[PDB]
Short mmCIF file of C-alpha atoms in Angstrom, two decimals:
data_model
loop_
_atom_site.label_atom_id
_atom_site.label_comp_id
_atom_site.label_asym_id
_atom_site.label_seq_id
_atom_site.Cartn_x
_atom_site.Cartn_y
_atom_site.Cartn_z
CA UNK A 1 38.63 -15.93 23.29
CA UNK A 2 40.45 -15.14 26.31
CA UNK A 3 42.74 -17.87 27.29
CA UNK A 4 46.11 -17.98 28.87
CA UNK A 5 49.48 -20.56 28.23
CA UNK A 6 50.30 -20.83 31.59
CA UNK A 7 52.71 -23.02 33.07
CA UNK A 8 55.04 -23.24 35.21
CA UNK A 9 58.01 -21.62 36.70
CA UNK A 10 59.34 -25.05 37.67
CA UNK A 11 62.42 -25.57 35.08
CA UNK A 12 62.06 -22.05 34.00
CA UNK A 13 63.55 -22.36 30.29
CA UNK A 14 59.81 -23.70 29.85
CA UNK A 15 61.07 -26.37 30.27
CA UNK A 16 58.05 -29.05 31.80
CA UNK A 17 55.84 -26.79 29.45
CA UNK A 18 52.33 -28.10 30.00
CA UNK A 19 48.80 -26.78 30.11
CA UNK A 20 47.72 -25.44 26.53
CA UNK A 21 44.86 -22.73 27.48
CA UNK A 22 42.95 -21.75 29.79
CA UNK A 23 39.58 -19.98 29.39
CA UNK A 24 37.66 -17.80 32.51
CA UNK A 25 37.30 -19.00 35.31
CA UNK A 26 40.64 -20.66 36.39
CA UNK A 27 41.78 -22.72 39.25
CA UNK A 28 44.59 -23.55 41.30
CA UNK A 29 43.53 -27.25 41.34
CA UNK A 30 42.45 -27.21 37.41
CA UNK A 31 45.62 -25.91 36.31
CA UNK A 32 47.42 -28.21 39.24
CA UNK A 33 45.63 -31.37 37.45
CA UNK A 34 46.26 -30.18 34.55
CA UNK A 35 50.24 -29.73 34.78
CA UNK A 36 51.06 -32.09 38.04
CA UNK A 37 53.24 -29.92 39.67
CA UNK A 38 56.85 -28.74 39.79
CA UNK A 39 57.81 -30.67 43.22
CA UNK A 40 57.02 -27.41 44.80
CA UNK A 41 54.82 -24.51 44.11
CA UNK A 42 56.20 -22.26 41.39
CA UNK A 43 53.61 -21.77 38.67
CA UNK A 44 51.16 -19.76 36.78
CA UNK A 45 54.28 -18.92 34.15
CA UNK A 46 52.56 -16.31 32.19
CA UNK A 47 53.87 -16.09 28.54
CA UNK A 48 50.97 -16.45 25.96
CA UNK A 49 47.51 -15.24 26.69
CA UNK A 50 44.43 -14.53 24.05
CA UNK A 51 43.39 -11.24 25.87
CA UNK A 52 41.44 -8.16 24.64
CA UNK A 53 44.11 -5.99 26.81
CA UNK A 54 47.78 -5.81 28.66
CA UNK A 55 48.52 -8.34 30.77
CA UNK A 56 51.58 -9.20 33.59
CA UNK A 57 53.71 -12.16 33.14
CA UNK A 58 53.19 -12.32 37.36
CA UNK A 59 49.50 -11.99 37.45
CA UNK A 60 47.84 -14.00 39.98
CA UNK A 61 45.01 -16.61 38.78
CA UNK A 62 42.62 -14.84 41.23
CA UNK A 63 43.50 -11.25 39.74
CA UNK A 64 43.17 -12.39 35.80
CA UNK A 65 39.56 -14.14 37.20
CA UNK A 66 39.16 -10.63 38.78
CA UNK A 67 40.33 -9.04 35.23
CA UNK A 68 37.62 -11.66 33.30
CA UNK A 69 34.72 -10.61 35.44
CA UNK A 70 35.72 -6.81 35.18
CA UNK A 71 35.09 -7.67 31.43
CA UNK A 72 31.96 -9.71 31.61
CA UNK A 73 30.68 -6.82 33.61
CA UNK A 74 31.29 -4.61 30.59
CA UNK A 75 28.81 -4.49 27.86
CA UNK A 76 30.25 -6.97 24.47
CA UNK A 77 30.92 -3.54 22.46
CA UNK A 78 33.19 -2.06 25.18
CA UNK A 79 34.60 -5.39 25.33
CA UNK A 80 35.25 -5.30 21.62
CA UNK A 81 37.07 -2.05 22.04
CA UNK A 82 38.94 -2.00 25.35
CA UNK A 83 42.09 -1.76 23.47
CA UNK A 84 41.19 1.46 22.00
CA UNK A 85 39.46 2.55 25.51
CA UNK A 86 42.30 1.80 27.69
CA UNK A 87 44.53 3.92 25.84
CA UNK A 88 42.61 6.83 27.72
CA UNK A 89 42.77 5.11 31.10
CA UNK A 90 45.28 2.47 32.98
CA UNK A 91 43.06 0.47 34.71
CA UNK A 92 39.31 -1.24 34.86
CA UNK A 93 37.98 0.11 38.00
CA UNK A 94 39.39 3.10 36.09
CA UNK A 95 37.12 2.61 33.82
CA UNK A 96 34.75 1.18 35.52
CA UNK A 97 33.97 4.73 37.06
CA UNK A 98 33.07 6.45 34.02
CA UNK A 99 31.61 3.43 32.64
CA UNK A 100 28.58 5.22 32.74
CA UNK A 101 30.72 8.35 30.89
CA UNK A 102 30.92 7.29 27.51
CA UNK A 103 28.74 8.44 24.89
CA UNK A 104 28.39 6.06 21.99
CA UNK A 105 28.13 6.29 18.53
CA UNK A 106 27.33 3.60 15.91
CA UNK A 107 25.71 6.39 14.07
CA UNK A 108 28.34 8.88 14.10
CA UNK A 109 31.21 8.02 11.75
CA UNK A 110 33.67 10.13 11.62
CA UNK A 111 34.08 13.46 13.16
CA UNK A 112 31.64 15.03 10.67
CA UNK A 113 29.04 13.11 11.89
CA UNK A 114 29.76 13.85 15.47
CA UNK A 115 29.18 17.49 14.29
CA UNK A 116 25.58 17.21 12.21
CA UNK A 117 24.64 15.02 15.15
CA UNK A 118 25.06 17.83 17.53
CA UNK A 119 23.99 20.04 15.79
CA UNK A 120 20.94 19.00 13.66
CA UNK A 121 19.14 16.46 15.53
CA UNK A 122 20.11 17.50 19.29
CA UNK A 123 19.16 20.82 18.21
CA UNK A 124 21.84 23.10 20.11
CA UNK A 125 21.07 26.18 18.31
CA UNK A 126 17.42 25.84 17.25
CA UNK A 127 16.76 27.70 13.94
CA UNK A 128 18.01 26.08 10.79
CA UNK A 129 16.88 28.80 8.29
CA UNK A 130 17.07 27.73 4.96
CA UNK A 131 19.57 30.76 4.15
CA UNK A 132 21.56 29.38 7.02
CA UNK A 133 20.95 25.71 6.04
CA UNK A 134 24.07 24.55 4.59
CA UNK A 135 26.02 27.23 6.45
CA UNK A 136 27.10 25.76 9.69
CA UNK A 137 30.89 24.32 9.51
CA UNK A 138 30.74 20.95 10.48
CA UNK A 139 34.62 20.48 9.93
CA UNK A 140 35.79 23.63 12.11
CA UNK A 141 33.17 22.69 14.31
CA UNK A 142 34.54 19.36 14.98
CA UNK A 143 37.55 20.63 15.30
CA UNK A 144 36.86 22.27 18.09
CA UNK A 145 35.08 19.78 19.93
CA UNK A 146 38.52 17.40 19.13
CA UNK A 147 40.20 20.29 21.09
CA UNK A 148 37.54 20.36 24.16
CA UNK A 149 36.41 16.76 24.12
CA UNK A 150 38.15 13.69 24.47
CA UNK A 151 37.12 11.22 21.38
CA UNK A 152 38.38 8.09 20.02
CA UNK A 153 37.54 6.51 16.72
CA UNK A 154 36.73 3.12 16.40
CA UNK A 155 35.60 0.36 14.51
CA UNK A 156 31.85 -0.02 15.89
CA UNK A 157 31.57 4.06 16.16
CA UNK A 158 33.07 7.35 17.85
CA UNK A 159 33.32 7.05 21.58
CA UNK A 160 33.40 10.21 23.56
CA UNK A 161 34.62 10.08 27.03
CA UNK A 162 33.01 13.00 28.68
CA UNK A 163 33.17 13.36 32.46
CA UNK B 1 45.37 65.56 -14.11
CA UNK B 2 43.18 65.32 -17.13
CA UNK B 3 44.69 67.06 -19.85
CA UNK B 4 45.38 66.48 -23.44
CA UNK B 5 47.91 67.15 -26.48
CA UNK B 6 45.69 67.84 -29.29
CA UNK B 7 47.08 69.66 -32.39
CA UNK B 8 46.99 69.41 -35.52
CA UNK B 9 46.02 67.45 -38.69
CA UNK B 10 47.87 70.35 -40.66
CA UNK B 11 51.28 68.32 -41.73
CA UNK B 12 49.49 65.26 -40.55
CA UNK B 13 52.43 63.60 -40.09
CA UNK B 14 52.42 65.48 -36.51
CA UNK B 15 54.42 68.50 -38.37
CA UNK B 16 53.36 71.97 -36.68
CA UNK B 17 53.41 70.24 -33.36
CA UNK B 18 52.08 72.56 -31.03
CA UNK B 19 49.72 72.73 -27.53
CA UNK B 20 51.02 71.22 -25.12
CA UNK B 21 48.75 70.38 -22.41
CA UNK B 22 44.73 71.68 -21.80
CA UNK B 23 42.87 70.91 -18.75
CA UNK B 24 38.97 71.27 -19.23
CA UNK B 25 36.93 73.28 -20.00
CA UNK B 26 38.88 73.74 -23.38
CA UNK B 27 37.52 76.37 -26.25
CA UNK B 28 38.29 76.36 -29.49
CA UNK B 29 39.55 79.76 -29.77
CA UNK B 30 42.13 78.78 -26.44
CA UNK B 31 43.55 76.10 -28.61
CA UNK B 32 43.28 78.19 -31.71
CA UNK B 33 45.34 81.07 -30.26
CA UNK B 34 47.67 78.69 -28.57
CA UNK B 35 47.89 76.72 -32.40
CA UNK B 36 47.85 79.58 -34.97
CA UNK B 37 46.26 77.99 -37.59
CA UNK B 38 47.06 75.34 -40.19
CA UNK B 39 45.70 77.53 -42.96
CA UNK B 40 42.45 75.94 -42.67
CA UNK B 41 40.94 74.44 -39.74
CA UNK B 42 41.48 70.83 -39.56
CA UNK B 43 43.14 70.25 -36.01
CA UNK B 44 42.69 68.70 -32.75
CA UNK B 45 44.89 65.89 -33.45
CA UNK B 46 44.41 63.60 -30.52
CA UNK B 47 47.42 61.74 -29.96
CA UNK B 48 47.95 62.32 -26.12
CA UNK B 49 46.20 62.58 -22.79
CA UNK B 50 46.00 61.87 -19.22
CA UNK B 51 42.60 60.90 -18.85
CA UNK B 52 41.34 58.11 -15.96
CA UNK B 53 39.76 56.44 -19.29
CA UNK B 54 39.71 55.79 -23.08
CA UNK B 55 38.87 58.03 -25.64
CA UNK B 56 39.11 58.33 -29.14
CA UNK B 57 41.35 60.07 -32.15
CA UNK B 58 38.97 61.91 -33.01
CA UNK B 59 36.62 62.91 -30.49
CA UNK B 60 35.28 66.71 -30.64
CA UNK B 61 36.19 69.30 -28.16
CA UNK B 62 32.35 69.85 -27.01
CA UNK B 63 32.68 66.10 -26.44
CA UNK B 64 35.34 66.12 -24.71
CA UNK B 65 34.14 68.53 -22.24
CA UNK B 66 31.23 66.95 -21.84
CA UNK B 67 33.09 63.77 -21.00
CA UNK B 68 34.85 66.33 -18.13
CA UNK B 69 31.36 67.35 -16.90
CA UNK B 70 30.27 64.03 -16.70
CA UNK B 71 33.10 62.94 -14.88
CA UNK B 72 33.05 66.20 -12.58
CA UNK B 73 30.05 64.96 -11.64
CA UNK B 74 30.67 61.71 -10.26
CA UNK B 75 31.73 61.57 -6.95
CA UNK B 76 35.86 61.53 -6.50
CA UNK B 77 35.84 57.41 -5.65
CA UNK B 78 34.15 57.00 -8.40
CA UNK B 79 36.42 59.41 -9.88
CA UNK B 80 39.49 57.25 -9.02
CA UNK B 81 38.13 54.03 -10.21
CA UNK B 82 36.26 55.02 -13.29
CA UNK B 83 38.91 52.21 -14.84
CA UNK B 84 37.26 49.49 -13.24
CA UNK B 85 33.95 50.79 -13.43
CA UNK B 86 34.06 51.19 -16.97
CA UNK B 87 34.56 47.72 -17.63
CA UNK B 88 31.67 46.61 -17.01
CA UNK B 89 30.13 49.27 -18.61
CA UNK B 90 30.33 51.16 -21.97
CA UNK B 91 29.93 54.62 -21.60
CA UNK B 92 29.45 57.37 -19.05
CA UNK B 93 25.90 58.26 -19.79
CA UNK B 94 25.38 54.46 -18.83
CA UNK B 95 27.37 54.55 -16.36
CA UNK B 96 25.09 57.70 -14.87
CA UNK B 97 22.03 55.38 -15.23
CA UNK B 98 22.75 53.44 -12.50
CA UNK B 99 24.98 56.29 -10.55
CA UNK B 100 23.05 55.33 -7.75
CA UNK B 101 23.20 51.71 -7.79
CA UNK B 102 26.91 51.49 -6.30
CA UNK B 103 27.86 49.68 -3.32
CA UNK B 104 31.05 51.15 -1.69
CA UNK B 105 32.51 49.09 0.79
CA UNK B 106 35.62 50.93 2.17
CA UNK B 107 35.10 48.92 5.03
CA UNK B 108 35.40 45.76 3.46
CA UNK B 109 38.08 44.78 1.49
CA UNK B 110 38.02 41.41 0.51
CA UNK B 111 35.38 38.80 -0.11
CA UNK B 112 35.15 37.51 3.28
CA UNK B 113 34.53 41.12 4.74
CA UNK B 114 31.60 41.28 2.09
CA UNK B 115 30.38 38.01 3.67
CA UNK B 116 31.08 39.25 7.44
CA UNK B 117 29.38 42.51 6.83
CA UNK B 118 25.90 41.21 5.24
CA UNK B 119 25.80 38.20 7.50
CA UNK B 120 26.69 39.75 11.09
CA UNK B 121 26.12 43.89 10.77
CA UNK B 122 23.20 43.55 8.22
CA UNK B 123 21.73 40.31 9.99
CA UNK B 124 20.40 39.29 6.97
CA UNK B 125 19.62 35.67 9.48
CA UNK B 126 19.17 37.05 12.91
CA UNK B 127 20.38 34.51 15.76
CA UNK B 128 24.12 33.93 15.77
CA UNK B 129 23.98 31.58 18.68
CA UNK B 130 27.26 30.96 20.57
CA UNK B 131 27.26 27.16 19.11
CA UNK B 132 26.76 28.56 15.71
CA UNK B 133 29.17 31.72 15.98
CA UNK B 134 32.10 30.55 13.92
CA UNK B 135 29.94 27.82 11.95
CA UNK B 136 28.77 30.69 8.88
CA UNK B 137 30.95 29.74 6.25
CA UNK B 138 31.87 33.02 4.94
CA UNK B 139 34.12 31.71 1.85
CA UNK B 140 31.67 29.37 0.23
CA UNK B 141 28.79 32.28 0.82
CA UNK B 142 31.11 35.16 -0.72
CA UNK B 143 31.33 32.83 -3.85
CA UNK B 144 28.10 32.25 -3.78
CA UNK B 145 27.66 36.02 -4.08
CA UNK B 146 30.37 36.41 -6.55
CA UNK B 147 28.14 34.20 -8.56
CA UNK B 148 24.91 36.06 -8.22
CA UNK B 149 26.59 39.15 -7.48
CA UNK B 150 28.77 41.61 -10.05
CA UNK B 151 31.50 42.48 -7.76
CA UNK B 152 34.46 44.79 -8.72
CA UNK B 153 37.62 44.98 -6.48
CA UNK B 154 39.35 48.03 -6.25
CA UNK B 155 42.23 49.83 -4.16
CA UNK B 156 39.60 52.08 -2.22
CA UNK B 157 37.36 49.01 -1.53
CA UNK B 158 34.63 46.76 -2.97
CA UNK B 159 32.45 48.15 -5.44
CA UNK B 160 28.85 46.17 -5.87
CA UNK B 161 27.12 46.82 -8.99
CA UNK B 162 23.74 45.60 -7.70
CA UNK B 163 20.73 46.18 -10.52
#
């Protein structure tokens, strides 16, 4: 679980191809002990990482420790799913203003669900009459809210980013 | 509108065809001058009429315009869509039983409008709230009174034969 192949920009065919992975945190002088070094300085050559999103193949070792605590700051079901939830956004700090924005649901399904939810149990019309029981379209009305709200489907639930 | 060819069972075979048309009330010394006579008096050979519904080969005169008197007293609709409203009945006298059990829905013409109209104009629930304004699933609750409901659908609207 998140670890990166890198090394090193010194023969640059990957050639000298050392260090197998690396998991959070990384150091200069880890990695440096752990591949020699190049005569010079020319290093970190990203090409293989085990990462739960996009990374550069010229990230800095400080920045992906910066990316890896951005994640441990997360909660472990937003860090199961920040694939799907940075399709929305670009970036971390991104999302780490709404963080507090997303509404979770293990117990919502599908769309469906997301409906009878707001409807039955928040209770945002009151009366359920028995004559009006089953009459309340949870498909248009779920539809709709597709249209206003933004949604994603997941594996662990429905997360809706509202602002 | 209403008229018949009736004459005569003298030279069954519809020999001494004569009378053209009578519109009601029709005597039996109209159609006897307009006939002769076929020595005797066996006539009123029914073989032709425009009438809005089914009568027989046989049927008497006094019947007949009784049948005219009963439909000159239904209202014109009714009148126009004695057809359909005949189908689910059997006769006229019937039919003036429950005369006053008709629903006439000019205004709605479908299903649906049935569903609009005693949902939203008759308020047969009350609250429509905003969040629940599109959720009444009209379809599903005009087959549901299709099923309780004997519905007839005509050209000049939607006739309900409620008990």
């Amino acid at each position: 679980d998140m670890q990166v192949y890198i090394a090193n920009l010194g023969k640059y065919n990957e050639g000298e191809l050392v260090g197998a992975w690396f998991t959070f945190p990384i150091d200069f002088e880890e990695v440096k002990e752990k591949i020699g070094l190049n005569d010079e300085y020319e290093e970190y050559a990203i090409h293989d990482y085990e990462l739960p999103f996009t990374v550069d193949e010229y990230t800095s070792i400080g920045e992906l420790n910066r990316l890896w605590e951005m994640v441990s700051e997360l909660p472990e079901e937003l860090q199961s799913e920040l694939s799907a939830l940075l399709t929305h956004f670009s970036s971390i700090e991104e999302l780490s203003e709404h963080q507090e924005d997303i509404i979770i649901h293990s117990d919502c399904d599908d769309m469906y669900d997301v409906a009878r939810y707001y409807i039955e149990e928040t209770g945002a019309l009151g009366e359920v009459p028995a004559s009006l029981q089953n009459y309340i379209d949870y498909q248009a009305y779920g539809r709709d809210l597709d249209l206003s709200g933004t949604f994603i489907s997941t594996n662990h639930g429905i997360f809706e980013i509202v602002y």
